[PDB]
Scaffold this active site. Structure first.
Site, PDB file in Angstrom:
ATOM      1  N   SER A 326      -5.785 -27.885  -9.601  1.00 15.79           N
ATOM      2  CA  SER A 326      -6.679 -27.246 -10.560  1.00 15.79           C
ATOM      3  C   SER A 326      -7.699 -26.351  -9.859  1.00 15.79           C
ATOM      4  O   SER A 326      -8.064 -25.292 -10.371  1.00 15.79           O
ATOM      5  CB  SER A 326      -7.398 -28.298 -11.407  1.00 15.79           C
ATOM      6  OG  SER A 326      -8.138 -27.692 -12.451  1.00 15.79           O
ATOM      7  N   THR A 348      -3.353 -34.658 -13.443  1.00 18.21           N
ATOM      8  CA  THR A 348      -2.732 -33.341 -13.303  1.00 18.21           C
ATOM      9  C   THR A 348      -3.578 -32.337 -12.517  1.00 18.21           C
ATOM     10  O   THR A 348      -3.054 -31.573 -11.708  1.00 18.21           O
ATOM     11  CB  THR A 348      -2.377 -32.741 -14.677  1.00 18.21           C
ATOM     12  OG1 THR A 348      -3.529 -32.775 -15.528  1.00 18.21           O
ATOM     13  CG2 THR A 348      -1.254 -33.532 -15.324  1.00 18.21           C
ATOM     14  N   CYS A 349      -4.883 -32.343 -12.760  1.00 21.88           N
ATOM     15  CA  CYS A 349      -5.790 -31.412 -12.097  1.00 21.88           C
ATOM     16  C   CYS A 349      -5.808 -31.597 -10.578  1.00 21.88           C
ATOM     17  O   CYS A 349      -6.329 -30.755  -9.847  1.00 21.88           O
ATOM     18  CB  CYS A 349      -7.202 -31.540 -12.672  1.00 21.88           C
ATOM     19  SG  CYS A 349      -7.740 -33.245 -12.940  1.00 21.88           S
ATOM     20  N   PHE A 350      -5.239 -32.700 -10.105  1.00 26.24           N
ATOM     21  CA  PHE A 350      -5.157 -32.945  -8.672  1.00 26.24           C
ATOM     22  C   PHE A 350      -3.707 -33.101  -8.234  1.00 26.24           C
ATOM     23  O   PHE A 350      -3.433 -33.434  -7.079  1.00 26.24           O
ATOM     24  CB  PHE A 350      -5.951 -34.195  -8.292  1.00 26.24           C
ATOM     25  CG  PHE A 350      -7.362 -34.196  -8.800  1.00 26.24           C
ATOM     26  CD1 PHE A 350      -8.340 -33.448  -8.169  1.00 26.24           C
ATOM     27  CD2 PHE A 350      -7.712 -34.950  -9.906  1.00 26.24           C
ATOM     28  CE1 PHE A 350      -9.640 -33.449  -8.635  1.00 26.24           C
ATOM     29  CE2 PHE A 350      -9.011 -34.955 -10.377  1.00 26.24           C
ATOM     30  CZ  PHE A 350      -9.975 -34.204  -9.740  1.00 26.24           C
TER      31      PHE A 350
END
Ligand SMILES: [Ca+2]
Length: 375
Positions: A326, A348-350
């Site tokens: 992200s 998800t952002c990582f």
């Protein structure tokens, strides 16, 4: 030459917007009857060009929802329906295959099957035009026919390996003594069904002199001959949205990616560009099990596992070495978290998967597989 990413941008630049078209395409459907409602609307439009406008879709009279997410959901529900073998239009290429092909007996299942193929074509064209993906994977020959590329003996390998080896052997050896004939014997319903590859084929012997023709006719029977009108209807619908000259910049592999976002995910690359957190390692038992699992998963599940963790199904060009999270570069990550009771989660952002330290590979298989099914 341009690579896929450049091909796609180039492609999108040539795909000009329509001006003599309503600012939006309104279609309101009911979930219980998505297929018939979409067909009636999408096949009734005055001009096919109307399907190029911004999609304004309403499900079951539900007002107030973001039209962009509703459309994306529609592409998903409609795919589920169109590609359901229950309808007789498409069918699994083989019992052990998840890939789809046109059912040669389309007409027997539905007398009006050609217009439905043109419909499926229009929807496929809509997904590509609006930068969305269909849900379904077709046999390689399906994509080749779209690009007007020749179906080859190799395309047979990916579908029927036993059929491929028999033909390969024939190619590499003098078949004359086997006394083969220009016929194909298909076993159906506990009976053998013989079909002429050509007029009077039963009395013609396969030799070094006519075997290339033989192989060609077999490939045509398997992939082309009995579905000529179905595919023609599908292509007509598709090309009402995407000019076929344009789609021709892509090859079968790229086309498949463009339409259904599917492809063979190199697990090796994945494996080698993954980071490990909180005690995990490449040799750590659980991790070994994780990679064993991924290795035995279907191409579909490998992709959806990727979606689950990454937040997308896309694999970055140049491999997993350049996977982005992200806030910039972020290699696929697996972190030890929780107790063997709770399923794995996904940040998800990582691009990170929180994986509990399971005590059995088969347990890990279960837990992971279930957590992916909700995505
Ligand atoms: Ca390591």
């Amino acid at each position: 030459s341009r690579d896929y990413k450049r091909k796609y941008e180039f492609f999108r630049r040539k795909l000009k917007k329509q001006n003599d078209i309503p600012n939006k395409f309104e279609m309101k459907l009911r979930r219980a009857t998505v297929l018939e409602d979409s067909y009636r609307r999408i096949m009734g439009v005055k001009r096919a060009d109307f399907l190029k406008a911004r999609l304004w879709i309403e499900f079951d009279g539900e007002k107030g929802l973001d039209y962009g997410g509703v459309a994306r959901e529609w592409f998903f529900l409609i795919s589920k329906e169109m590609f359901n073998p229950y309808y007789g239009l498409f069918e699994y290429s083989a019992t052990d295959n998840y890939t789809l092909q046109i059912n040669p007996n389309s007409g027997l299942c539905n007398e009006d099957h050609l217009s439905y193929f043109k419909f499926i074509g229009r929807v496929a064209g809509m997904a590509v035009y609006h930068g969305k993906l269909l849900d379904g994977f077709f046999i390689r020959p399906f994509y080749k026919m779209m690009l007007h590329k020749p179906i080859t003996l190799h395309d047979m390998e990916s579908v029927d390996s036993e059929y491929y080896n028999s033909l390969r052997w024939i190619l590499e050896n003098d078949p004359t003594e086997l006394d083969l004939r220009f016929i194909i014997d298909e076993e159906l319903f506990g009976q053998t069904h013989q079909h002429e590859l050509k007029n009077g084929g039963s009395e013609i012997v396969v030799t070094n002199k006519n075997k290339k023709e033989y192989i060609y006719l077999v490939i045509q029977w398997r992939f082309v001959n009995r579905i000529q009108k179905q595919m023609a209807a599908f292509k007509e619908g598709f090309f009402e949205l995407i000019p076929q000259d344009l789609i021709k910049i892509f090859d079968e592999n790229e086309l498949e990616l463009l339409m259904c976002g599917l492809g063979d995910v190199d697990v090796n690359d994945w494996r080698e560009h993954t980071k490990y957190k909180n005690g995990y390692s490449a040799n750590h038992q659980v991790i070994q099990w994780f990679w064993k699992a991924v290795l035995m998963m279907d191409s579909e599940k490998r992709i959806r596992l990727l979606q689950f963790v990454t937040g997308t199904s896309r694999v970055p060009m140049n491999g997993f070495a350049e996977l982005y999270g992200s806030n910039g570069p972020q290699s696929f990550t697996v972190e030890q978290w929780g107790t063997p009771e709770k399923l794995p989660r996904a940040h998800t952002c990582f691009n990170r998967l929180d994986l509990p330290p399971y005590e059995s590979f088969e347990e890990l298989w279960d837990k992971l597989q279930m957590a992916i099914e909700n995505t």
